[PDB]
């Protein structure tokens, strides 16, 4: 990366906001995944959208790759600079604007995390529900198409993103649904917002997201329920969904995951396949939901439900399951699967995944959003054991292909990044791949928008 180019970057954002130091680049060369990569050639912190546009235009016209960087909590290598280039850390743009409580909407810049937003919203009676376990950038969550434990009731990022401000690869500024617009539905033209949700930084740089807010629940009840088997817990889940109980959260942990969370969070749940449950409503609706849900879990051998402060500990332990799993083997890294299947096929593939983890030498914990037909196998890898990393990636791809055989998808929320590009080709086929690539090419003709990811 030439000195003239670095000085041009500094002329846009200011000398303090450009770094070519090795340690700073290495800190921005990875996410929470096991993926490695060479670091970016520079890290740049634009201070406003005009600067984002000018940095993008400078890189694009000079043939320098651009890697958008939020909070670096992704798990598929999205920020790994496989082709070098400029890592654009967007988190100094950290303002909440256009809070429209009467319309249930708000606009956030990339430095705003969900934590920050919901702190800003207490006493409003509103909240933002999509809850990845990590303290992630909300714009990064829009970029990855994130979901979380609340999605079964309150939707994913795709359901809750109403508008996006995007700096396109050559610097142009796009408001996907129109500048300042927010509304419940539209048929006006082609929906551009949905194209950029889940684009992972390969189609442009999200510099603000317009989010749907939700009313806080009247009352909340959380519980855990222990089961004799994985089959029993997942059958209960499928039957709760088929009975149309509007559960707020329904999270599965196998016995391995439960034990790991116990050890990492000082929970003391019985070590067993377990559902973490949460219910929202009035006292009347809560009592109705509880007895219909307890009736189903009892059918499948579930324990009597183990009912402010304790639920916060419950869901904090769940949100930290990724780290609880890593703590089972200190020094290891992790790779998560993320298949999502038609719900009636979820018992088969979870039970099969449990059996396959047992029959293998790998350490795996099972957790996730089974209300969506989605789950994670968190597989531990020794960073220096090349045999084990080979066997983990083979395990992940076999699981992904089993989900595709069942009519499902290889990723419910994490994205493709570096890890699932072959699975994506199988999932959507040659015409799906070419169509996605044609969309990538019209927005990023020179292929400099986070190269090597997704496609």
Residues within the interface to ligand FAD (CB under 6 A): 31-32, 67-75, 78-79, 90, 110, 132-134, 136-137, 139-141, 143-144, 146-148, 200-201, 205-206, 322, 413-414, 450, 453
Q: How far is the CB of 140 from ligand FAD (least distance, A)?
A: 2
**CA nearest neighbour of 134 among 149, 123, 155, 124:** 149
Nearer to ligand FAD, 281 or 417 (CB): 417
Nearer to ligand FAD, 71 or 289 (CB): 71
Q: How far is the CB of 285 from ligand FAD (least distance, A)?
A: 26
Cα 341 to Cα 77: distance, rounded to the nearest angstrom = 24
Half-sphere exposure of 347 (CA within 13 A, CB side): 12
Q: How far is the CB of 165 from ligand FAD (least distance, A)?
A: 10
Q: How far is the CB of 306 from ligand FAD (least distance, A)?
A: 23
Which residues partner with 366 through β-bridges? 377
- Please check whether residue 377 is in contact with residue 349, taking contact to mean a CB–CB distance below 8 angstroms: no
- Please check whether residue 107 is in contact with residue 49, taking contact to mean a CB–CB distance below 8 angstroms: no
Cα 442 to Cα 439: distance, rounded to the nearest angstrom = 5
Structure tokens at 159: 């359901």
Q: How far is the CB of 411 from ligand FAD (least distance, A)?
A: 9
Cα 51 to Cα 11: distance, rounded to the nearest angstrom = 10
Q: How far is the CB of 67 from ligand FAD (least distance, A)?
A: 6
Nearer to ligand FAD, 203 or 232 (CB): 203
What is the SS3 assignment for 77? coil
Q: How far is the CB of 320 from ligand FAD (least distance, A)?
A: 6
Question: What single string gives the DSSP state of each residue in 120-178?
Answer: HHTTTTEE-----SS--BHHHHHHHT---TTHHHH--HHHHEEEEEEE-TTS-EEETT-
Taking each helix axis from N to C end, the angle separating 283-299 and 230-242, rounded to the nearest 10 degrees, works out to: 140
Cα 132 to Cα 291: distance, rounded to the nearest angstrom = 29
DSSP H or E run through 351: helix 346-358
Q: What is the phi-psi region of residue 266: left when phi exceeds 0, alpha when psi lies from -120 to 50, beta otherwise?
A: left
Give me the torsion for CA of 262, 268, 273, 276, rounded to 10°: -90
Nearer to ligand FAD, 72 or 273 (CB): 72
Nearer to ligand FAD, 232 or 267 (CB): 267
With vertex at residue 167, the alpha carbon angle to CA 164 and CA 173, rounded to the nearest 5 degrees, is 85
Q: In angstroms, how far is CA 241 from the centroid of its own chain? A: 23
Q: How far is the CB of 390 from ligand FAD (least distance, A)?
A: 24
Q: How far is the CB of 236 from ligand FAD (least distance, A)?
A: 21
Nearer to ligand FAD, 414 or 440 (CB): 414
Q: How far is the CB of 446 from ligand FAD (least distance, A)?
A: 17
Nearer to ligand FAD, 78 or 371 (CB): 78
Nearer to ligand FAD, 143 or 233 (CB): 143
Nearer to ligand FAD, 43 or 141 (CB): 141
Cα 88 to Cα 400: distance, rounded to the nearest angstrom = 31
Cα 153 to Cα 130: distance, rounded to the nearest angstrom = 10
Nearer to ligand FAD, 166 or 350 (CB): 166
Q: How many helices (H) and strands (E) does the chain have?
A: 16, 17
Q: How far is the CB of 383 from ligand FAD (least distance, A)?
A: 17
Nearer to ligand FAD, 68 or 84 (CB): 68
Cα 417 to Cα 455: distance, rounded to the nearest angstrom = 9
């Amino acid at each position: 990366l030439s000195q003239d180019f670095v000085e041009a970057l500094k002329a846009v954002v200011g000398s303090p906001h450009v770094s070519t130091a090795s340690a700073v680049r290495e800190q921005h060369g990875h996410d929470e995944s096991m993926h490695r990569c060479q670091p970016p050639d520079a890290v740049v912190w634009p201070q406003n959208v005009d600067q984002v546009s000018r940095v993008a235009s400078l890189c694009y016209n000079q043939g320098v790759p651009i890697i958008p960087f939020g909070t670096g909590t992704g798990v598929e290598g999205g920020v790994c600079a496989v082709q070098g280039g400029v890592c654009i850390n967007l988190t100094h743009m950290d303002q909440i604007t256009e809070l429209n409580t009467e319309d249930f909407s708000v606009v956030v810049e990339p430095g705003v995390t969900r934590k920050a937003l919901n702190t800003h919203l207490r006493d409003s009676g509103l909240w933002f529900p999509v809850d990845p376990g990590a303290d992630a950038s909300l714009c990064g969550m829009a970029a990855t198409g994130a979901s979380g434990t609340n999605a079964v009731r309150y939707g994913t990022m795709r359901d809750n993103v109403i508008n996006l401000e995007v700096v396109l690869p050559d610097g142009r500024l796009l408001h996907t649904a129109g500048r300042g617009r927010h509304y419940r539905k539209s048929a006006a033209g082609y929906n551009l917002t949905g194209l950029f949700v889940g684009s992972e930084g390969t189609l442009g740089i999200i510099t603000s997201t317009t989010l749907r807010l939700h009313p806080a629940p009247e009352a909340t009840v959380a519980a855990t329920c222990a089961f004799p088997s994985v089959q029993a817990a997942v059958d209960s889940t499928v039957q709760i969904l088929q009975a149309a109980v509007p559960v707020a959260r329904i999270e599965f942990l196998d016995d391995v995951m439960m034990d790991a969370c116990n050890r990492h969070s000082k929970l003391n749940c019985p070590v067993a396949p377990t559902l973490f449950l949460e219910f929202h409503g009035s006292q009347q609706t809560l009592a109705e939901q509880l007895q219909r849900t307890e009736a189903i879990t009892q059918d499948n051998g579930g324990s009597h439900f183990s009912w402010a402060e304790k639920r916060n500990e419950l869901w904090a332990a769940r949100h930290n399951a990724w780290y609880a799993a890593l703590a089972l083997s200190p020094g290891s890294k992790a790779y998560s699967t993320d298949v999502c299947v038609p719900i009636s096929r979820l018992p088969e593939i979870l039970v099969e995944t449990k059996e396959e983890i047992k029959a293998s030498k790998l350490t795996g914990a099972i957790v996730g959003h089974v209300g969506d037909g989605n789950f994670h196998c968190i597989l531990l890898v020794d960073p220096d054991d090349a045999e084990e990393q080979r066997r983990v990636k083979a395990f992940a791809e076999n699981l992904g292909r089993r989900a595709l055989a069942l009519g499902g998808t290889c990723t419910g929320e994490h994205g493709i990044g570096l890890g699932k590009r072959q699975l994506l080709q199988e999932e959507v086929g040659p015409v799906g791949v070419e169509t996605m690539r044609q969309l990538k090419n019209t927005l990023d003709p020179r292929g400099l928008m986070n190269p090597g990811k997704v496609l």
